[PDB]
Design a protein around this ligand. Structure first.
Ligand SMILES: N=C(NCCCSC[C@H]1O[C@@H](n2cnc3c(N)ncnc32)[C@H](O)[C@@H]1O)Nc1ccccc1
Ligand SMILES: N=C(NCCCSC[C@H]1O[C@@H](n2cnc3c(N)ncnc32)[C@H](O)[C@@H]1O)Nc1ccccc1
Lengths: 302, 302
């Protein structure tokens, strides 16, 4: 219901200008089409689609924000193009059988933490016309190795001596919590490894639980203290002007930052080493099981 | 139950070293005394009190954190001095009728947002021995005038043109939300004005709802865009070594930062001007009614 999350999303220029660039630079995708905006929030993506020449835009949001979207759409005189419907996309009555295009910003931290993709996929299976399109269409998840003994000490070792007192028992509560923060790209000590490719046209709900064996190509002899996760978002299908953005630490920071899994036992790596591990994602919410250097830890996102 | 709030509090050096300095530099207050730590969290203040020579420390917390405190107190071999009790201080059974000293860190944003002072005062009225002491004993709240057109534009004007679209209807949701952030002390355009003095020995619950007429002594000709609130914490009673810390923007930042009330209509002020207003605090939670320059706004803290 609250606007704070909407302000954070809207003020992310990488996020919001990627969507704008996609829609405005590929207007043939929207021209005289019926568009569904799943979880439309303030309705900005619905308005971009109307500006690109949409015949009709259905903006669906379950929360109080939809009342603000109703006012925003009237303030921009688009009420003849954009219809707003309050409710879960799984429950609402749409005034059409099918839609030509689905658009959504459904992505969570590490792509899948508190993500809306389940609801986007429900909307796809129920409402997308034969030969229609869903955007963004292609997503990847990547891991990269990190060396940051100081950040590791600030989070873990800290608990050994707190103003003269032992609190070492606190570390077992800290290690299993993934950290969302922007990484200094100087602390990256491997090439990235892709662990997941999603095409929204063909992926099912069951595909979003997955396991990947990975190889981190180590680029610096150092103490590996953490594995960082991030994701890349692609607008491809039928585009003359393809759009991509990365939430990786080598790219301009976004509100998604990067997801960091601290190692209980940091371990030394060598430039040239092929560091092999296994990662598994499970839902209910989201957990990430990591095996590396012959130990295993499951992480969750608070 | 969660450790994140405990880590934030413990990593605030101003907060935690003020309490440490108070207890270690005034050990006569603790020497062979019975001490009650209201909402003890990880039990750090209970351990400082045992180190200063407390005969017995009762640490009370309602949340899961108390189980970690039990382990922490054993890890530092203080289980013969510190007894930990899980539950609301309003409900738990204490193994004593009375205590000599009550200590607590109960303070919220703007002192009173999501504060524990109600529970500290219940503990005082029920458990403090005749002639005992409560720490910290003295609190003040202050207001100061702010000029920051750029921050005001980032929060308010922003909504007028969002990637070509009007969202001006969003401003009425934004203005009533107080912002918690660290202020550039360069943006302060008045002397502070005190609006509230609390002595924990004598204040009742009813005193924490209050009204104050105030005068801001303007020190710079500028556009007044906001009023900032903060608080000062005093350890006085029976101290040889008095301790104070301020959460004001002229002082080292704390986890409490400063509370900022944006003006809907910024207005020009002159150096030398005595700017008069009225502030009122109400509970349930907390709201702050501000009258200044012939308009009134009620603010809450999200
Ligand atoms: N950028 C993010 N992006 C994904 C999630 C944002 S929720 C975005 C919007 O979608 C709405 N919504 C959620 N589930 C459904 C549903 N089943 N049916 C209809 N409306 C729904 C919700 O009311 C909200 O306004 N997340 C994020 C944002 C800030 C910080 C961290 C992550
Ligand atoms: N520094 C802060 N300081 C005040 C509040 C912290 S709560 C501090 C601790 O007190 C416990 N507690 C709260 N009410 C009661 C009760 N009635 N009876 C027993 N135990 C209680 C709570 O489980 C928690 O561990 N607040 C703060 C912290 C971080 C960010 C912003 C404000």
């Amino acid at each position: 219901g609250h606007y704070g999350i909407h302000e954070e999303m809207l003020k992310d220029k990488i996020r919001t200008e990627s969507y704008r660039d996609f829609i405005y630079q590929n207007p043939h995708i929207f021209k005289d089409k019926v568009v569904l905006d799943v979880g439309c929030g303030t309705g900005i993506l619905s308005m971009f689609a109307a500006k690109a020449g949409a015949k009709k835009v259905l903006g669906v949001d379950q929360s109080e924000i939809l009342y603000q979207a109703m006012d925003i759409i009237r303030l921009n005189k688009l009420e003849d193009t954009i219809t707003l419907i309050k409710g879960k996309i799984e429950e609402v009555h749409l005034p059409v059988e099918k839609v030509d295009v689905i658009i959504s910003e459904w992505m969570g931290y590490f792509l899948l933490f508190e993500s809306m993709l389940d609801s986007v996929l429900y909307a796809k299976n129920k409402y997308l016309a034969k030969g229609g399109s869903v955007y963004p269409d292609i997503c990847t998840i990547s891991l990269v190795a990190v060396s940051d003994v100081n950040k590791h000490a600030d989070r873990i070792a800290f608990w050994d001596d707190v103003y003269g007192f032992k609190m070492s028992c606190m570390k077992k509560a800290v290690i299993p919590e993934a950290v969302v923060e922007v990484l200094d790209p100087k602390t990256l000590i491997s090439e990235p490894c892709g662990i997941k490719h999603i095409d929204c046209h063909t992926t099912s709900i069951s595909d979003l639980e997955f396991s990947s064996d990975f190889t981190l190509k180590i680029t610096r002899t150092s103490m590996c203290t953490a594995i960082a996760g991030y994701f890349d978002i692609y607008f491809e299908k039928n585009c003359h002007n393809r759009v991509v953005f990365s939430t990786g630490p080598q790219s301009t920071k976004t509100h998604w930052k990067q997801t960091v899994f601290l190692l209980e036992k940091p371990f030394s790596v060598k430039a040239g080493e092929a560091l092999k591990g296994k990662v598994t994602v499970h839902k209910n919410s989201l957990t990430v099981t990591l095996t590396l250097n012959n130990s295993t830890q499951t992480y969750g996102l608070q």
